[PDB]
Every structure is written in C-alpha cells, then in structure tokens.
Amino acid sequence: AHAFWSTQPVPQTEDETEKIVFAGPMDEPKTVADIPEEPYPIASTFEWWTPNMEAADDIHAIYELLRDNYVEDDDSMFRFNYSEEFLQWALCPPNYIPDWHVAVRRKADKKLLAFIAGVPVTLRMGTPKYMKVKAQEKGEGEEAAKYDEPRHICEINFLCVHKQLREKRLAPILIKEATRRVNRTNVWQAVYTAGVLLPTPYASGQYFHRSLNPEKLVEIRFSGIPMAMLKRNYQLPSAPKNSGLREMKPSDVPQVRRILMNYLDSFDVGPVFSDAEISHYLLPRDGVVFTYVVENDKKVTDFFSFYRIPSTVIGNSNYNLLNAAYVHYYAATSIPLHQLILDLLIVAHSRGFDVCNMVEILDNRSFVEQLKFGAGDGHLRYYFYNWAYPKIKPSQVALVML
Ligand SMILES: CCCCCCCCCCCCCC(=O)SCCNC(=O)CCNC(=O)[C@H](O)C(C)(C)COP(=O)(O)OP(=O)(O)OC[C@H]1O[C@@H](n2cnc3c(N)ncnc32)[C@H](O)[C@@H]1OP(=O)(O)O
Ligand SMILES: COc1cc([C@H]2SCC(=O)N2Cc2ccccn2)ccc1O
C-alpha cells in the first residue's frame, strides 16, 4: 500500500485512470475558510522556514541542500546540481507566492533539512481531444467541456529530504504543509512530475539524449563506444545554419508569445503565458536560459530555448561536473523543426555543453533520429494533484518541467 498517497485526492490505480473520461476535481469542494491557518504540526526539534528566494544567502542554503541531496540516477553516478541563479529564476516567476516555498530546519542549529517549492502556472487542463470526441458521440459534450477554462494552479518541484533524514515520513508532512499554503491561497490543483512511479500519472515519456562531447560522456560512463569515429559521428557545425538566428531581445516578447501560444494550443495539456511570463521564462540569462529567434525581414518566425542544469559526476576523478542543456519551449513556422533544433545543438555545443537532454513531449520525437538523439534510461511521469484526467500520450503534453 501507499500509507500517504492512499489518503490523497489522486487516482489510486492504473485501473481507475483508464476509467476517467472527463477532466475535473476529485476531492470534496472546499473554501479557504475550511483550511487551517496554523502550519501542520512537526516535531519540536524542527521548525518551518520560508526562505526568501530572492536573498542570495537563502538561495545558497537551498542550493547546497539540492547539490548534496537532490535527484540521482538509479546508479548513483550523477546528481543534479541546479545553480543558484537557476533556482532564483525557476522559483521567482511573475506573481510567485513567497509562502509556496517551504523548508524544514533543525530548530537548534538552523540546519536546512528539507524543501519543496510551488510556483503559479496557468494551465490548460480540460478534457483531452480523444475524449471530447467520445463525449460528443454519447451526447455528453457539456460535461466534457465544463473545465476547459485555463486554470491557475500550483506547479511543484524541488522536493528534497536530506540524506540523513530519509524514510522518516518527512516527505508526507512537507507535501501536506505545501498543500495547506497553496489551499489558503484558494488554489486546489497542482501539477508535478517525478522519475518514480506514484499513483497515478496521466502521461509518461522517455528521456532522450544527444551527445555533444562523446569523449567526456564515455569517460564518465554515461555512454559507451574508435573515439575518433564517435567524435566524427556526433560532430557539429561550428556556427548556426539559419541565417538571422540571433539571441532573443526584450522587443521580441510579443511575437514569441504569439507563435508559442499558437503552437502549444494544439496540445491537450499546456501552459498559457502572459508577456511578463514569456520575458521571465525565455529572455536569455547567463548560465541559466538561452533563447534564439529566427527573424527574417524584421519578423520573428521561429525560436528555440534551452536551459542549463549541470550534474555532479559522483564517481569519476577526471571530471566533477557534467554540463547538460535541456530542450525548453520552441516553435517553427518557416523551417522543419529538425532544422531549427540543429541550431540548438550547434549553439549548445559551441557554448561548451556536453549533452542535450529532453523528454519526448511536444513534437520532440519528430527530430530524434535525424539529430541523433538516443533514448535514455530516464522516464518522466506527469501527475496532477486533485484532478481526474484521462491517460494521454506524452506528445500531447506541452508543459516543460524545470
Ligand atoms: C493543491 C496543491 C497541492 C500541492 C502538493 C501537490 C503534491 C506534490 C507531491 C510531490 C511532488 C514532487 C515532485 C518532485 O520534486 S520529484 C523529485 C523528488 N526528489 C528527489 O527524488 C530527491 C532525492 N530524494 C529525496 O529527497 C527523498 O527520497 C524524497 C523527499 C523524494 C522522499 O523522501 P523519503 O525517501 O525520506 O521518504 P519519506 O519516508 O519522507 O516519505 C515516503 C513517502 O513519500 C512518497 N514519495 C517518494 N518519492 C516521492 C516523490 N518524488 N514525490 C511524491 N512522493 C514521493 C513515497 O511513495 C511515500 O509515500 P507512500 O508511498 O507511503 O504513500
Ligand atoms: C543516467 O540517465 C539519465 C539520468 C537523468 C538525471 S538523474 C540525475 C541526473 O543528473 N540526470 C541528468 C543526466 C545525467 C547524465 C547524463 C544526462 N543527464 C535523466 C535521464 C537519464 O536518461
């Protein structure tokens, strides 16, 4: 059984979620007034802390916790090493809610012991297309469309319990207190992803990896194999191919918004961004996010973005860090996607990245073979809290998780 997740308003089995035909809430309907104003009880040796994620020193403390105690691969060879500048960026988008950033500290020495963050996101999460077709067949269109409006919900990430406190049931308490703070803000859904299987994902996709520095990837034992031929296989132009590719600037915001919103529209689950959220999530930030538009005749017709997450290489001597670029949002209207993403690779490689990672969401599958991405061991499972949702393919997901 799941002593925690069984008590939660999520579908409980694969079986249950094959049964779901309409999008909609699961729990009893509640009001802010129904929600306790006191934080969830925790042991007297601990205290709740709300870090200030725009304070360098508080960001550094979260940083160290995640550097030492966040997500590893199944073989404990790699561990995410999210940068401080990246943490500020991911956790402080426009209209972020400081109270959604939730820590536990040892009351004695203020040692940071645990963390979970929520940020606001406006998400389209109405009944998916294949199920609206069935609803129409059965004269149930209105029930199917009832929750079509884009919803203001919580996106959770960065759940982390210090290694020294593992399997002590501290993660359920963090999730309950996060849930409480979010509910007190009159928000009743969340979206989150995990590499592990929990009850119960609405979508799952494989990760894909494109080697940019195979010598290094082999050396750290991420890849296997002659090195001259492997280098030759993965070699890339030294400069981008699309004439008038350039980094995004602030005046591109409205057109990038337009073409992104038009594109993400075609997917069942996807975010809606204001101009302020496009500027936050897509304007270039050194070491963090990198975004390039195609502009021809003073008009932005395509773009791509990727973000950086270095990983600690745990076992190797010769290297302590892996530099990885993650495919972020993009849109193509003037060139095949593979031609657009080729430039992403050239740019990533030119800037010193070792590998380009993505999950098979969006139309990421459409360029896998031609650009030489290979399937990895990772899977990313997508979940909602308090939201019934029919199983969809990952190529119907348009929400990139950081
Ligand atoms: C309305 C708004 C709602 C807001 C909240 C929305 C929900 C958000 C949900 C969180 C979204 C997070 C998205 C990400 O950030 S996914 C990345 C999570 N982080 C890591 O994997 C870092 C390395 N690992 C750790 O820090 C710990 O092992 C964690 C903290 C993950 C578990 O700590 P620990 O190992 O010390 O265990 P425990 O004894 O305290 O707790 C055991 C219980 O925890 C359940 N568990 C294990 N892994 C996960 C997991 N990734 N999501 C949710 N639950 C998980 C597990 O099944 C068990 O419950 P049950 O099986 O007994 O029933
Ligand atoms: C080792 O395989 C994977 C690792 C990961 C995550 S787990 C901790 C981490 O640092 N990963 C990122 C990573 C590590 C090595 C190569 C590419 N991506 C995601 C997808 C994968 O296929």
UniProtKB/TrEMBL annotation:
Protein name in UniProt: Glycylpeptide N-tetradecanoyltransferase
Gene3D superfamilies: 3.40.630.170
Family per record: Belongs to the NMT family.
Gene expressing this chain: NMT
Cross-referenced InterPro entries: Acyl_CoA_acyltransferase, NMT, NMT_C, NMT_CS, NMT_N
Keywords: Acyltransferase, Metal-binding, Transferase
Family matches, as PROSITE patterns: NMT_1, NMT_2
Binding site for CoA: H2, F4, W5, V161, E167, R169, A171, T193
Chain positions recorded as Mg(2+) binding sites: L165
Single GO molecular function: metal ion binding
Signal peptide positions on this chain: none
Binding site for tetradecanoyl-CoA: H2, A3, F4, W5, L159, V161, R166, E167, R169, L170, A171
Residue ranges of every copy of the Glycylpeptide N-tetradecanoyltransferase C-terminal domain listed in the record: 219-393
Glycylpeptide N-tetradecanoyltransferase N-terminal domain boundaries: 26-203
